[PDB]
Amino acid sequence: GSSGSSGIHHLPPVKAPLQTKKKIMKHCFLCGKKTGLATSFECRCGNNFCASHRYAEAHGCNYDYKSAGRRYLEEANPVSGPSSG
Ligand SMILES: [Zn+2]
Ligand SMILES: [Zn+2]
Numbered sequence: 268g269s270s271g272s273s274g275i276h277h278l279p280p281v282k283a284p285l286q287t288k289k290k291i292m293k294h295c296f297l298c299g300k301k302t303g304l305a306t307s308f309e310c311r312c313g314n315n316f317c318a319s320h321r322y323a324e325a326h327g328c329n330y331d332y333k334s335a336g337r338r339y340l341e342e343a344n345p346v347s348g349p350s351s352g
Contacts, residue, residue: 295319297326311336 293303295317302308308321312330320326 291303292301293307293315294301296314297316297320300306300317300319302315302317306318307315308318310316310321310323310326310328310330311332312323312328314326316322316326323330323332
């Protein structure tokens with residue numbers, strides 16, 4: 268003769284879908300129209316503007332771009348300049 272018994276247990280698995288998302292959201296600095304996603308440009312100053320205000324003048328740019336880049340030109344007075352022979 269004889270006898271005996273016992274017990275058992277269990278436990279469910281643990282896990283979580285760790286997702287992550289992050290995208291840049293740019294937008295004209297003048298008016299404030301979305302540009303990042305699409306229609307984005309850079310100005311001599313750096314500020315990001317829209318295709319409509321992408322040009323410096325468009326937003327009365329401040330950056331001094333006189334040395335490197337110009338539009339209006341004038342003829343200098345008549346000089347002899349002996350430099351040349
Ligand atoms: Zn704009
Ligand atoms: Zn500018």
